[PDB]
Amino acid sequence: WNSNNLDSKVGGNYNYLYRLFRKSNLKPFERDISTEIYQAGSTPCNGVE
Amino acid sequence: QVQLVESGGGVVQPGRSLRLSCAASGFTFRSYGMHWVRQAPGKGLEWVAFISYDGSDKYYADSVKGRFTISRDNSKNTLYLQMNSLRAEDTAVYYCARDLSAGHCTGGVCYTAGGIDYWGQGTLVTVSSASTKGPSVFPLAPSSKSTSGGTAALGCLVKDYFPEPVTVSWNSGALTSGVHTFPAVLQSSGLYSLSSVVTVPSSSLGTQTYICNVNHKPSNTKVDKRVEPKSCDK
Amino acid sequence: QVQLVESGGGVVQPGRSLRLSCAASGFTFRSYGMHWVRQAPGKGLEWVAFISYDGSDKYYADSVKGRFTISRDNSKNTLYLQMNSLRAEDTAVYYCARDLSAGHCTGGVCYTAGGIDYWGQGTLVTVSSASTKGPSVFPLAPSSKSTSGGTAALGCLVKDYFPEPVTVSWNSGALTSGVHTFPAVLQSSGLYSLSSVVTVPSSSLGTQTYICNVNHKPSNTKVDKRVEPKSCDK
Amino acid sequence: NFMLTQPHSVSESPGKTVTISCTRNSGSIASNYVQWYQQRPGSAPTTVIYEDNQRPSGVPDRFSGSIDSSSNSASLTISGLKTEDEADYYCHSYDSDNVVFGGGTKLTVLGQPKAAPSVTLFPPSSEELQANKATLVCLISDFYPGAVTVAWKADSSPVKAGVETTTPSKQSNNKYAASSYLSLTPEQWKSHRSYSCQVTHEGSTVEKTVAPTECS
Amino acid sequence: NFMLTQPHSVSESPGKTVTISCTRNSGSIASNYVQWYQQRPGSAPTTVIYEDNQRPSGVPDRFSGSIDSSSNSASLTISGLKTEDEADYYCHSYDSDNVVFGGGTKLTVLGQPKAAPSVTLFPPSSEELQANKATLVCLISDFYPGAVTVAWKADSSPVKAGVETTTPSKQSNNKYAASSYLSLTPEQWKSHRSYSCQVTHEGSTVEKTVAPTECS
C-alpha cells in the first residue's frame, strides 16, 4: 500500500537504501548486509571509492 | 493409416530373457489377430506362433514350445512377447505381423487362424558375447587426380562399431543425392564393418563443406567427420 | 577375470554429506569381505575400514572414528561407504578391494583380516578451496636450433587449471610413440600445470600436421590451436 | 517338418507370362487355406495372395492365383511382367502339421542391356595395418541381372572362412551393387603373394589381381 | 594406535639386494597378520608380500620377505634388482584393532650414470600482469639420481610460503625432471631485488636467476 504520508519527509529522506551490485543472485529467503566496495576491474578497491 | 511400430529388441546375453513389443493404430486392435515372425539373415522366413483376439487360445511352433510366452493387453492396446533361454541361432530380425481378421475359416472343417495381411517394421535381436563398442571413423580423402571434368569417390568408413542402428548421412541428411550405404557385415572378430560413399562432382572437392553425420544412439555416439584435401607433400 | 569399479568422487563442498559405491565384476561378492581404503596424492595408503562377508562384523579406523559410515548390500552386488565431514587431508582416491583371505588365523588369533591382490579402478574425492576453474592453454613451438636431421620437441602447454585429471594423446590417440605427458603440477595459486610432447625427426618440419589434444574432463575444456613452429618474422 | 519347393530365380522378357511352383514333398494341400507373400530385398515382406484369387490394396492386376490337386500344388500366374517388382516370393498355409514357409524364387525381367562385370580390389587402409586389423572388400556394382556369385581365393587356394557377400540392391540407374567381405588377419593377409575376386555373372567373368605390398 | 618406520630413500645398484627395516616401535608384531605393497608413483600400489613369504601372481620371483623375530621387525629381500623396480615400497599390517602404514621408501637403482642438472626459468608475461597475479616458474630436467631437493630464497632469505616442489618425473632419456612454481603478488615481485631457485642434486646445488627487465 502507499506510504507517502508515513515514509516521506520534508527535504527528502535518505534513510532508505537498496543494493545495486552483487557477485551472485541471492538465495531464496536470504538476506545480505555486506557493504564491501564492488570491484568491476582488476585493481582492488582497498575500501576507497 | 495402417502401420505397425517396432522397438525394444537388441543386444542380450545368451540365457537371459527379453520382452519384445509391437504397437499399431488406425484399426481395431482388440478384434484383429496378429502374428510373430523372425528372419534369420540369409535364410527363409519362419513361423512363430498365433494368439487369438480374446487372449484365450495359444498355439506355438516346435522350437519355442514352453520356452516362449506371449500375451497382449487389450486396454493398453499392445502385444508383449517374452523369450527365455536364448540360443545362438536366435539372432534374427523379428517382425510382428497380422492376420486377415480374427480366426475364421470355412468348410465345416476349419480352425481359427488365417493369413498374413500386414507385417511390422522389423526388430533386430543380438544374442552373443561381444559387448558395446563405439564406432571409429576416418576421413577418406579422395584421390587428388579427380579434377577437370570427372566424378570423384569419397566417403566415411564405419568400422569396429557395435551394435545397430547406425545412420550415415551427409549435411545431416540434407544432401540425399548420391548417398549409397553398403550393407553391414560381420567380421571374424565378431565386429562390424561397412562402407558408405556419395557420388559427387570432382569439381566440388575442397569447395563445398563436407561433413558426414554418423549417429549410434544406443552407445550415445554422434561423430562429425570432415573431408579435406590430402597433404601428400614431401 | 575378476575386477572392481569405483565411481562417485569428484567436486564436493566441505562439511556436507556424500555417498560412494564399489561395483564388482567376476566373483561371488557376497562370499567375500569388502574393503574401504583411500590414497592421498603426495601421500601413501590410508586405510579406512572393513566389513564382514555378511555385514555382522565391522572394523573401523581411529582417526575418523564414527565420522563415516560403511555398508554393503548382497543382492545388488555393490559396496557402499557413507562418508561424512570432509576435511583437508582426506583428499584421496578411494580404492575398493577384494580380500585375499576371509578370516584366516595364526592358530590362536582368529579375526577377519585384510589382504588385497586385486584392486579397483579408483574414485577420487575433491575437497578444496579453489573452484573448478577453466584453463588457458598455450602452444609450445620448437625452437629453430633443432634442424638438419635432429629432433625438434613441440606440442602444447596447459597451465593454471583445476581439478585433476587431464589426459594427453598425440593425434587423438593415432600417435603413441613419443608421448610423454609430464605429471600435473599443483601451484601455490591452487592451480595445475604440466607438459606433454612427442619425439619426431626434424624431417617432418613444414609437412607434418600437429594437433595437440587436451582432455581436462572434470571441467571439460578443450583447446585446438593450430600447432606449428612460429615463423621467423620481425 | 515340411517345405515348399520353388526355384531360386526366374528370368523372362517383360512381354511374357510366368508362374511359380508351390508344392510339398508330402501331405495334401488341396481344398486347404493358402496365402502367398513377397519380399523385396532388405525390407519388410508384403502380402500378395491369400486364399486363391484375392487381391490386396495398391497392387496392379497382373497377378493371378490358382490351386491344383493333381500334383498337390498351387500356381500364382503373372502376366505382363515389369522390372519394378524383381524380388523373391514364398509359400504359406496351414497344413496337416504346422504353418509352413517356402524357400523363395528371385524374379528377373530383362529391362536393360547386359554389361560386363567390373571388379576392383581394396586392400586394408594404411592406418589400419598398424592397428592389426584386416577386412578385404570387393566391389560388385552396375551389373545386370542382379544375380552374382563371389568366391574368395588366396594364392589360387579357395578361401572359405570369413566369407560374407552382400545381396545386390537396386541403384539409381536400375542397376545393382553388391559387396563381398573377407575377414582375414594382417599376419595372414600379408603372407599370400596374390589373390582373386572372382565374379561369375551370367557366364561372364573378369578377374582383377593386385598385390598386398601396395599398402606400404 | 601403532606406527611403522621406513627409510624414505635407499639407493642401490640393481646387481645387489636391498632391505627395509619394517620397525613398528610399539608392542609386538610376532604371530600376527603381515602385508606389503609397492607403488609406482602416480599409480595404485601393488601388493608385494602377505604373511611372511607369500608372493602374488605376475610379480618377479626375486622379491622375498622376512621378519626379525628378536627385534620385532620385518624385512624384504629382492635379489638381482632391475631398473624397472624403481618405485615406492610400503609396509602395511594389522594389529587386532586397526591397520598401520610405514614411512615409505624411495628405492634408487644405480644402474645408470648421473646427470648434470641444467636449469632454465620461465618469466611471467606482460598481459597477465594486469590482474596483479604472477607465478615464478622453475624448470629442472635431466638429473640423476631422482632424489632431488628444491628450495626457494629471496634476497638470500629462505622462502617457505608458496613453495612447492613437484614429483621428479621419469624422462625419455632415462633421466629425471620436475618443476616448481611460486605465485606471489607483484608487490613482492617488485620489492625484492632478485630471487633464486635453489635445487640440491645429491649435494650439488643448481640454481638460475630471473630478472625484472623482462617484466617491463
From Swiss-Prot, chain A:
UniProt protein name: Spike protein S1
Region of interest (Immunodominant HLA epitope recognized by the CD8+), ranges: 13-21
Region feature Receptor-binding motif, mapped onto this chain: 2-49
Organism whose genome encodes this protein: Severe acute respiratory syndrome coronavirus 2
Stated consequence of mutating T43K: In strain: Delta/B.1.617.2, Omicron/BA.1, Omicron/BA.2, Omicron/BA.2.12.1, Omicron/BA.2.75, Omicron/BA.4, Omicron/BA.5, Omicron/BQ.1.1, Omicron/XBB.1.5, Omicron/EG.5.1
Function as written in the Swiss-Prot or TrEMBL entry: Attaches the virion to the cell membrane by interacting with host receptor, initiating the infection. The major receptor is host ACE2. When S2/S2' has been cleaved, binding to the receptor triggers direct fusion at the cell membrane. When S2/S2' has not been cleaved, binding to the receptor results in internalization of the virus by endocytosis using host TFRC and GRM2 and leading to fusion of the virion membrane with the host endosomal membrane. Alternatively, may use NRP1/NRP2 and integrin as entry receptors.
Record annotation: effect of changing V10P: In strain: Omicron/XBB.1.5, Omicron/EG.5.1
Gene label: S
Top-level taxonomy: Viruses, Riboviria, Orthornavirae, Pisuviricota, Pisoniviricetes
Subunit structure: Binds to host ACE2. RBD also interacts with the N-linked glycan on 'Asn-90' of ACE2. Cleavage of S generates a polybasic C-terminal sequence on S1 that binds to host Neuropilin-1 (NRP1) and Neuropilin-2 (NRP2) receptors. Interacts with host integrin alpha-5/beta-1 (ITGA5:ITGB1) and with ACE2 in complex with integrin alpha-5/beta-1 (ITGA5:ITGB1). May interact via cytoplasmic c-terminus with M protein. May interact (via N-terminus) with host bilirubin and biliverdin, thereby preventing antibody binding to the SARS-CoV-2 spike NTD via an allosteric mechanism.
Region (Disordered): 20-49
Effect listed in the UniProt record for changing K9T: In strain: Omicron/BQ.1.1
Effect of E49A: In strain: Omicron/BA.1, Omicron/BA.2, Omicron/BA.2.12.1, Omicron/BA.2.75, Omicron/BA.4, Omicron/BA.5, Omicron/BQ.1.1, Omicron/XBB.1.5, Omicron/EG.5.1
Impact after mutating L17Q: In strain: Omicron/BA.2.12.1
